[PDB]
Amino acid sequence: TKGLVLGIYSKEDEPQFTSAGENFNKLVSGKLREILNISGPPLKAGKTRTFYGLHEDFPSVVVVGLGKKTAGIDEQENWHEGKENIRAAVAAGCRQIQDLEIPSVEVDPCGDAQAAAEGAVLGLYEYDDLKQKRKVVVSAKLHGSEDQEAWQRGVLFASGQNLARRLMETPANEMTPTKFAEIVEENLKSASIKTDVFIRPKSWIEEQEMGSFLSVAKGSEEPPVFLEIHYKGSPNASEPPLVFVGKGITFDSGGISIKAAANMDLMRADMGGAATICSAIVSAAKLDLPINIVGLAPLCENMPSGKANKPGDVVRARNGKTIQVDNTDAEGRLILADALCYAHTFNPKVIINAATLTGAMDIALGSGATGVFTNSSWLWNKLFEASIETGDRVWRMPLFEHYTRQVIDCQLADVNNIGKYRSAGACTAAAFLKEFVTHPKWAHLDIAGVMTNKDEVPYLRKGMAGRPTRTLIEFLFRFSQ
Amino acid sequence: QNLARRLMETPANEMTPTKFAEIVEENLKSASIKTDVFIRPKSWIEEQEMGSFLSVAKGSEEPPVFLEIHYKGSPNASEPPLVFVGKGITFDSGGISIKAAANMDLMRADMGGAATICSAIVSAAKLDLPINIVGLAPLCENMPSGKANKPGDVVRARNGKTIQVDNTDAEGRLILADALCYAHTFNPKVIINAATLTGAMDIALGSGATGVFTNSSWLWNKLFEASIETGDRVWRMPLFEHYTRQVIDCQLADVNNIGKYRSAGACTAAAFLKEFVTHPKWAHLDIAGVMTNKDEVPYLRKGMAGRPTRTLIEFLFRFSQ
Amino acid sequence: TKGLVLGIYSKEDEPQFTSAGENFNKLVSGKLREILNISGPPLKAGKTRTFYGLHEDFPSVVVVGLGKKTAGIDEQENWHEGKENIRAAVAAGCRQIQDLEIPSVEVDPCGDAQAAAEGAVLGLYEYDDLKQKRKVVVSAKLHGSEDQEAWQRGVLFASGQNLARRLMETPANEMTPTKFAEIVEENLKSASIKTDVFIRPKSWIEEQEMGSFLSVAKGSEEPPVFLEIHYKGSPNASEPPLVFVGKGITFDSGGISIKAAANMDLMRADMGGAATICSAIVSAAKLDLPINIVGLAPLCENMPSGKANKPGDVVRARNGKTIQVDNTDAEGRLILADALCYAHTFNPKVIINAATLTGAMDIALGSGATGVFTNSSWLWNKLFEASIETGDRVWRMPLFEHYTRQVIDCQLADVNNIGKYRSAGACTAAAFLKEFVTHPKWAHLDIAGVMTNKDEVPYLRKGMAGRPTRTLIEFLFRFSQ
Ligand SMILES: [Mg+2]
Ligand SMILES: [Mg+2]
Ligand SMILES: [Mg+2]
Ligand SMILES: [Zn+2]
Ligand SMILES: [Zn+2]
Ligand SMILES: [Zn+2]
């Protein structure tokens, strides 16, 4: 009827199966084991072999390599590793069932119900919607029934990421500053009714004296929308929140300080800041976590025009500081100077802001880890441990006065959007944001390296990657528990 | 530190692969007599099957010199050492994969790897610290010529691995594939290699901290605490299979000098060096951001900065005590 | 023991098998047919499915899609197409047996013994030699015995191409102007004893007044070697030959007019001119074709140095004409001005020269067809028909006075290496070579677009492609018959 993804590990006496696999073997009377011998070598991690007709009801039994049984927290790679194995191995498996055009598939728990699910789902995602030529929409349910609460945690966690991936991925002619808000609000409210949304317009942002976010929007004729998310998880409402901020340039052309045509079509994902953290709240509300969280994301676009932000321009952020706007492409810095200032109104506990800010971050670490600066070692620890679990790494980066210094000397004004020199890119830019933050637990997460995937993460197909959404989710789970 | 600053700073017409060795040896021996130096020539490096360091030198007509420092601090001689390795391109013009004229006169300090760690031993011997340390630094130059290293070239490092040489400016990676391989001969405890490797490091952190990758959290801790004291910061950077993967797929050969993509620069390059290291306590220190100072560090005047020499010294003090 | 590549086509009543396949089905008693149903959809062209243990002696039976049974000469695509199908389909198949680490494989004739062979072999080639980490060396024999003369024509034709692919592919530190000659001579002599080789040195080239080829070599310290191939196929020796000329820069760095570091490591295949045509003669001598052919290829390197060719330089080609050398990267033009002049000495019938000359050719047609200019419609026809058969297309390109005109006005000299303007790149360059040719049947073949493959040609793996060697071979077969 449908396919099945089985798992196996490496040697002992004969490479052991995952118990779903062992079970299914006994069932076809050893002949899965038997054909595995006959087929070729053994399956190291992530490798895949497909055995037809072993079962009546399962034409295609794909067996995938799970690596070491006891594979675990790796001191170097900074993650759990079995999980990492399982994720690529059922991803590998599920993409084989999807190429066999099998619309539904059943999947080995593989000892970590959650991981096989985040594999099956992250693994299968595309963003098919605008091609009439699409792959089969395969349905992936668990195999078994003993462990359902964590496989659904898989499908949950993986989906909230897939959310961001479709929110980033979609062309910025479709996924606008409004349509992004429309979907989010819709996603947050279908997540829980303990939620309020505020797709605040130009008038309110004007009213908020958000000079800097506004200076940015004015290039396009597409409207600014400052978005406000709320989830009231806490039993006592009055618990002060955790506030997520996120940059939402739906399209970045650089503005007057205009980009090269070389791969500028990826700037449709310069709203990844906004998308990631939004998907995290949509997800923390599906988990319905005992915490009040607040999504804040200035959605607008960077374009050149007769009224676009010019080089040399001093503008006023909400907080009273002026900014020389020396480079119109350093604009997340300005959109974020204001929603950061607004974050403090909420009396937060943690202000995690996130953004696709600098290509320099990409030059830095580049899709390994999502670089995170933070005046909180406590906070750093927290994001990092969560990243160990989820596998979407995070690497601390420096928030040193050294860097502030460069941004702070300024011809016209109080702060400059680009620092004195070429060097230290993400640090300069994070140094600019701290000028707009007085809280003891702030975290900049520059996501410009994890904006995309090709092959680097196995279980993600090519296209917007939606990172580090699950590490953000997992952090708020653990902070709630 | 000022030593390294004059060793980096001086024009690469004066401060050659030999004159660097001459001064170092002179500085190490005036530091203590418990010292031996070996300004080994092309013949010995040829003999060492250091194909990769050699492939690099052959552009210039200026001679390669693989340098060997020794300081026998330990009461029992037979304590296995701490080994410092350091890249010593006295001048880097990129070679056939040639640089822009924009500020190429700073490549006279692409021997900062060699200079920093050398100054550290000169210093650990003045302190006369109860440890045997070994300086190792391939000194040579990158130039274009009728016999310069070409793009596409597979060469053989000492250890048997081949390297596609896709970009002649990624050459510290090759000079270092070999002195890293030679480091293991010494049965070290710590192999700290140091180099002005990638401009990407400069793009990364850029003169705040000297980026350090290491398969040793222990070792990381050690360099970092020392940096707390001295103020010459150090920032850990990732040595993830992710990055190895890019360097490892290779058309012609076993390893490629530049990885698959533009992104993750210092990590790709550090991933290349680990292919030439099997020891449990290795540390890459990319010094390309701290190569210079203007005003960033107050107490250094404008010019070659000589970083992170005191953090290296302070580490070997504390490791000795 | 070993694997097997079977073929099947599309529908009629039930998709027909190739008779090897039909035969092997009856043999396992229909159960190959049977499992094909059970497995998934049908296999359109180039697609592949792998069935283990159907046979005792054939653990892995891969079945591959052959497209239409009656698939043939395509008016648009300008080729035979069944052949094109079969080539990618067994290539597809053989790369599955090689990933199953099966060292030997037996292969379906697929109705075109030759094509399945040029697929199995072109398909399997890599250039493993410098990695210690290599894939299994799988051995591919025919399945059956009825049609052996044409499958060996496959393996022949595909191998002579694979020759060029290893001659191009190898680093120019190993594959020098001498080591290229050493291998060729070795390959030509093991092809037939009716052969002479002349690895003529600088002294002889100096003696030949080959000022222009020499001006080029002088940058490197690596020696020039003008190579002379001979194959005396003709019953009467005195039949005047067909002469192939080919540019052999083993490495092109541009010289003083120096290249960008962006992918300059591909210039190790700027000796593809020399390699292609050399492999063709090595091959025409294995076929032992009733024609005398003469290989001529100036092997040397382009480097910058204290004695490198400078911009502005007038040098003297053999024939008396001077050349302003305005761009040291237009150097195939000069290496070729002289071996073209030498070609006429031989009293040829056809002078086919071939070279990786212009990136403009790549901009032009770019790996579809190998652009060919020729003052002979007869000759054009000939190369083109051969290309229909082999599938390695060729596209005529213009040799108009228009273009000569630009190259011909020259400040200092008689000819300039780059023409007056940016436009018309390959035509300007081919216009330069005709100034060095007075014969009625000359053909420039610019191979800069087919220098590489990624995925464009199915049955070639990523790396130097070795094109258009079989079309050259096939032309000399047909010219001999
Ligand atoms: Mg921008
Ligand atoms: Mg360099
Ligand atoms: Mg050229
Ligand atoms: Zn932006
Ligand atoms: Zn260098
Ligand atoms: Zn050329």
Tab-separated table of C-alpha atoms in Angstrom, chain C residues 105-367:
chain	number	residue	atom	x	y	z
C	105	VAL	CA	29.360	-6.109	-14.438
C	106	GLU	CA	27.640	-7.558	-17.384
C	107	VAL	CA	25.692	-5.242	-19.641
C	108	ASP	CA	22.578	-5.368	-21.883
C	109	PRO	CA	23.444	-4.808	-25.615
C	110	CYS	CA	20.309	-2.671	-25.586
C	111	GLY	CA	19.964	-3.026	-29.361
C	112	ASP	CA	23.088	-0.941	-29.937
C	113	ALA	CA	26.144	-2.822	-28.795
C	114	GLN	CA	28.347	0.227	-29.433
C	115	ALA	CA	26.205	2.723	-27.522
C	116	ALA	CA	25.772	0.616	-24.397
C	117	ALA	CA	29.600	0.260	-24.399
C	118	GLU	CA	30.355	3.994	-24.884
C	119	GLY	CA	27.857	4.425	-22.005
C	120	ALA	CA	29.338	1.788	-19.642
C	121	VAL	CA	32.840	3.080	-20.164
C	122	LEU	CA	32.390	6.928	-20.500
C	123	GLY	CA	29.922	6.433	-17.764
C	124	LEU	CA	32.274	4.734	-15.419
C	125	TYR	CA	35.476	6.865	-15.923
C	126	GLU	CA	36.895	9.084	-13.107
C	127	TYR	CA	40.684	9.811	-12.839
C	128	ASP	CA	41.152	8.214	-9.463
C	129	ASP	CA	44.887	8.084	-9.553
C	130	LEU	CA	45.820	10.795	-7.049
C	131	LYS	CA	43.315	10.033	-4.339
C	132	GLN	CA	44.169	7.040	-2.038
C	133	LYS	CA	40.324	6.983	-1.554
C	134	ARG	CA	39.077	5.532	-4.895
C	135	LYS	CA	35.769	3.859	-6.007
C	136	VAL	CA	35.748	0.127	-7.009
C	137	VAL	CA	37.252	-0.669	-10.358
C	138	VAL	CA	34.435	-2.320	-12.046
C	139	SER	CA	34.919	-4.333	-15.061
C	140	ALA	CA	32.338	-4.105	-17.797
C	141	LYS	CA	31.933	-6.846	-20.242
C	142	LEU	CA	29.098	-7.301	-22.694
C	143	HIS	CA	26.125	-9.460	-21.884
C	144	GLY	CA	25.846	-12.002	-24.630
C	145	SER	CA	28.092	-12.889	-27.542
C	146	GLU	CA	26.127	-12.348	-30.695
C	147	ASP	CA	27.332	-8.765	-31.265
C	148	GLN	CA	30.965	-8.395	-30.092
C	149	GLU	CA	32.622	-6.360	-32.922
C	150	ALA	CA	30.484	-3.211	-32.234
C	151	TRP	CA	30.549	-3.381	-28.354
C	152	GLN	CA	34.310	-3.458	-28.729
C	153	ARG	CA	33.891	-0.423	-31.058
C	154	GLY	CA	32.129	1.041	-28.039
C	155	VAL	CA	34.878	0.303	-25.536
C	156	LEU	CA	37.356	1.503	-28.176
C	157	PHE	CA	35.695	4.825	-28.973
C	158	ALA	CA	34.799	5.520	-25.331
C	159	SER	CA	38.432	4.687	-24.249
C	160	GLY	CA	40.103	7.033	-26.704
C	161	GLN	CA	37.871	9.701	-25.260
C	162	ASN	CA	38.711	8.602	-21.677
C	163	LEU	CA	42.355	8.957	-22.801
C	164	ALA	CA	41.892	12.686	-23.514
C	165	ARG	CA	39.927	12.970	-20.300
C	166	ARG	CA	42.902	11.677	-18.287
C	167	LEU	CA	45.357	13.708	-20.480
C	168	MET	CA	43.345	16.963	-19.789
C	169	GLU	CA	42.339	16.212	-16.254
C	170	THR	CA	45.817	15.453	-14.696
C	171	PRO	CA	47.547	18.475	-12.989
C	172	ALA	CA	49.937	20.356	-15.280
C	173	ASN	CA	52.745	19.641	-12.835
C	174	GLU	CA	52.486	15.984	-13.731
C	175	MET	CA	51.110	16.031	-17.226
C	176	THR	CA	53.801	18.310	-18.707
C	177	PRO	CA	54.740	19.109	-22.347
C	178	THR	CA	57.018	16.054	-22.189
C	179	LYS	CA	54.930	13.562	-20.119
C	180	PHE	CA	51.927	14.337	-22.410
C	181	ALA	CA	54.206	13.345	-25.398
C	182	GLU	CA	55.540	10.360	-23.593
C	183	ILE	CA	52.102	8.876	-22.978
C	184	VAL	CA	50.851	9.743	-26.483
C	185	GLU	CA	53.736	8.153	-28.276
C	186	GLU	CA	53.282	5.170	-25.997
C	187	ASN	CA	49.618	5.040	-26.797
C	188	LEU	CA	50.031	5.465	-30.490
C	189	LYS	CA	52.724	2.760	-30.771
C	190	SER	CA	50.762	0.298	-28.649
C	191	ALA	CA	47.962	1.121	-31.074
C	192	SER	CA	49.922	0.084	-34.194
C	193	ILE	CA	53.571	-0.337	-35.157
C	194	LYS	CA	52.808	1.632	-38.462
C	195	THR	CA	53.756	4.688	-36.465
C	196	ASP	CA	56.538	7.154	-35.883
C	197	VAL	CA	56.841	9.771	-33.115
C	198	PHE	CA	58.801	12.944	-32.836
C	199	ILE	CA	58.997	14.746	-29.543
C	200	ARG	CA	60.943	17.507	-31.230
C	201	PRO	CA	62.688	19.912	-28.693
C	202	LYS	CA	63.309	23.651	-28.552
C	203	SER	CA	66.292	23.300	-30.967
C	204	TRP	CA	64.187	21.923	-33.739
C	205	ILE	CA	61.364	24.414	-33.108
C	206	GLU	CA	64.013	27.152	-33.078
C	207	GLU	CA	65.255	25.611	-36.365
C	208	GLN	CA	61.682	25.641	-37.737
C	209	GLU	CA	61.510	29.385	-37.208
C	210	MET	CA	58.456	28.908	-35.051
C	211	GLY	CA	58.859	32.306	-33.512
C	212	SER	CA	55.278	32.555	-32.381
C	213	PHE	CA	55.032	29.140	-30.500
C	214	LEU	CA	58.399	29.916	-28.992
C	215	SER	CA	57.387	33.374	-27.773
C	216	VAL	CA	54.730	31.652	-25.797
C	217	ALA	CA	56.902	28.960	-24.136
C	218	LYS	CA	59.508	31.360	-22.853
C	219	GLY	CA	57.514	32.439	-19.833
C	220	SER	CA	57.880	28.966	-18.112
C	221	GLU	CA	61.144	27.142	-17.376
C	222	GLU	CA	59.266	23.951	-18.519
C	223	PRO	CA	60.510	22.886	-21.957
C	224	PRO	CA	58.641	23.257	-25.292
C	225	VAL	CA	58.149	20.124	-27.214
C	226	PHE	CA	56.529	20.268	-30.657
C	227	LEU	CA	55.033	16.787	-31.066
C	228	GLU	CA	54.757	14.820	-34.311
C	229	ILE	CA	52.345	11.831	-34.567
C	230	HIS	CA	52.161	9.435	-37.572
C	231	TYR	CA	49.983	6.637	-38.571
C	232	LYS	CA	50.442	5.164	-41.971
C	233	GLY	CA	47.126	3.523	-42.560
C	234	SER	CA	47.202	3.688	-46.373
C	235	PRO	CA	48.166	0.706	-48.434
C	236	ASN	CA	50.108	3.084	-50.606
C	237	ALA	CA	52.240	5.054	-48.256
C	238	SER	CA	52.323	8.100	-50.560
C	239	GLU	CA	48.604	8.984	-50.086
C	240	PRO	CA	48.841	12.518	-48.654
C	241	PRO	CA	47.407	12.710	-45.138
C	242	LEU	CA	44.772	14.139	-42.989
C	243	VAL	CA	46.494	16.400	-40.480
C	244	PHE	CA	45.323	17.137	-37.038
C	245	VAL	CA	46.864	20.125	-35.169
C	246	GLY	CA	46.041	20.824	-31.479
C	247	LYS	CA	46.972	23.400	-28.934
C	248	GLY	CA	48.876	22.141	-25.979
C	249	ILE	CA	49.288	24.802	-23.316
C	250	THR	CA	49.572	22.286	-20.336
C	251	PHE	CA	48.946	25.223	-18.077
C	252	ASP	CA	47.579	28.651	-18.986
C	253	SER	CA	47.895	31.321	-16.286
C	254	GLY	CA	47.392	34.040	-18.915
C	255	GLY	CA	51.039	35.039	-18.559
C	256	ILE	CA	51.716	38.757	-17.958
C	257	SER	CA	48.168	39.306	-19.139
C	258	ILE	CA	47.306	37.237	-16.087
C	259	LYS	CA	44.156	35.414	-15.110
C	260	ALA	CA	41.869	35.687	-12.084
C	261	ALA	CA	42.235	33.095	-9.332
C	262	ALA	CA	38.594	32.112	-9.995
C	263	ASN	CA	38.799	28.647	-11.235
C	264	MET	CA	42.173	28.954	-12.943
C	265	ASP	CA	42.864	25.369	-11.971
C	266	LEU	CA	40.882	24.332	-15.070
C	267	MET	CA	43.650	25.705	-17.328
C	268	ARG	CA	45.380	22.417	-16.809
C	269	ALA	CA	43.003	21.489	-19.617
C	270	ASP	CA	44.106	24.164	-22.063
C	271	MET	CA	45.990	21.207	-23.695
C	272	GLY	CA	42.605	19.733	-24.648
C	273	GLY	CA	43.251	20.772	-28.239
C	274	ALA	CA	46.355	18.571	-28.244
C	275	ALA	CA	44.694	15.815	-26.155
C	276	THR	CA	41.499	15.374	-28.251
C	277	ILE	CA	42.993	15.054	-31.649
C	278	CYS	CA	45.793	12.923	-30.220
C	279	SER	CA	43.317	10.517	-28.790
C	280	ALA	CA	41.548	10.475	-32.069
C	281	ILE	CA	44.723	9.235	-33.934
C	282	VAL	CA	45.516	6.752	-31.077
C	283	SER	CA	42.024	5.573	-31.698
C	284	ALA	CA	42.185	5.586	-35.612
C	285	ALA	CA	45.313	3.477	-35.362
C	286	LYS	CA	43.556	0.971	-32.964
C	287	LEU	CA	40.753	0.793	-35.586
C	288	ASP	CA	43.549	0.642	-38.210
C	289	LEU	CA	41.884	2.761	-40.725
C	290	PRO	CA	43.146	2.968	-44.419
C	291	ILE	CA	44.383	6.497	-44.071
C	292	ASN	CA	47.584	8.261	-43.162
C	293	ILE	CA	46.862	10.886	-40.410
C	294	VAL	CA	49.482	13.303	-38.817
C	295	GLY	CA	49.243	14.604	-35.265
C	296	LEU	CA	50.821	17.925	-34.688
C	297	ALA	CA	50.579	19.677	-31.365
C	298	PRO	CA	52.798	22.416	-29.869
C	299	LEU	CA	53.063	21.546	-26.144
C	300	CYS	CA	54.292	24.380	-23.863
C	301	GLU	CA	53.105	26.545	-20.917
C	302	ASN	CA	51.943	30.101	-20.281
C	303	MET	CA	53.520	31.673	-17.191
C	304	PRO	CA	54.682	35.103	-15.982
C	305	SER	CA	58.373	35.696	-15.397
C	306	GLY	CA	61.382	37.909	-15.985
C	307	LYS	CA	61.392	36.597	-19.559
C	308	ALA	CA	57.686	36.116	-20.209
C	309	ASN	CA	55.967	37.396	-23.403
C	310	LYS	CA	55.067	41.041	-22.884
C	311	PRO	CA	52.107	43.049	-24.085
C	312	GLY	CA	52.857	44.977	-27.301
C	313	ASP	CA	55.141	42.338	-28.734
C	314	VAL	CA	55.642	41.669	-32.326
C	315	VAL	CA	56.928	38.162	-32.942
C	316	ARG	CA	57.477	36.228	-36.192
C	317	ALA	CA	55.445	33.210	-37.229
C	318	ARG	CA	57.125	30.623	-39.418
C	319	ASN	CA	55.300	31.885	-42.575
C	320	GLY	CA	56.796	35.395	-42.378
C	321	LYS	CA	53.851	37.201	-40.802
C	322	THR	CA	54.364	39.230	-37.633
C	323	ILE	CA	51.865	39.269	-34.720
C	324	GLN	CA	51.204	42.112	-32.236
C	325	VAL	CA	50.880	40.151	-28.849
C	326	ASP	CA	48.480	42.516	-27.101
C	327	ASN	CA	47.181	40.033	-24.774
C	328	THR	CA	49.411	37.288	-23.552
C	329	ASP	CA	46.278	35.129	-22.753
C	330	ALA	CA	45.373	34.969	-26.468
C	331	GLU	CA	48.248	32.426	-26.893
C	332	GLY	CA	46.686	29.429	-28.473
C	333	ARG	CA	46.333	31.769	-31.474
C	334	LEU	CA	50.249	31.949	-31.583
C	335	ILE	CA	51.108	28.338	-30.682
C	336	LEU	CA	48.690	27.551	-33.531
C	337	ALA	CA	49.859	30.070	-36.113
C	338	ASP	CA	52.991	27.851	-36.418
C	339	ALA	CA	51.783	24.269	-36.235
C	340	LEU	CA	49.142	25.360	-38.844
C	341	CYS	CA	51.951	26.583	-41.113
C	342	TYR	CA	53.809	23.405	-40.562
C	343	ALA	CA	50.623	21.411	-41.464
C	344	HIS	CA	50.889	22.480	-45.099
C	345	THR	CA	54.307	20.832	-45.508
C	346	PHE	CA	52.611	17.480	-45.248
C	347	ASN	CA	50.430	18.170	-48.320
C	348	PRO	CA	47.208	17.284	-46.318
C	349	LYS	CA	43.684	16.663	-47.600
C	350	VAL	CA	41.945	17.950	-44.538
C	351	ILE	CA	43.665	20.106	-41.893
C	352	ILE	CA	41.508	19.765	-38.772
C	353	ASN	CA	43.020	21.887	-35.984
C	354	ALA	CA	41.401	21.778	-32.529
C	355	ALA	CA	41.844	23.860	-29.400
C	356	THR	CA	40.425	25.163	-26.161
C	357	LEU	CA	40.822	28.718	-27.604
C	358	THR	CA	38.196	31.282	-26.352
C	359	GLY	CA	35.963	31.566	-23.293
C	360	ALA	CA	33.685	33.448	-25.780
C	361	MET	CA	32.840	30.083	-27.396
C	362	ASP	CA	31.748	29.001	-23.993
C	363	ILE	CA	29.576	32.067	-23.761
C	364	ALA	CA	28.300	31.242	-27.212
C	365	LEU	CA	26.960	27.709	-27.369
C	366	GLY	CA	28.518	26.447	-24.081
C	367	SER	CA	28.856	22.625	-23.889
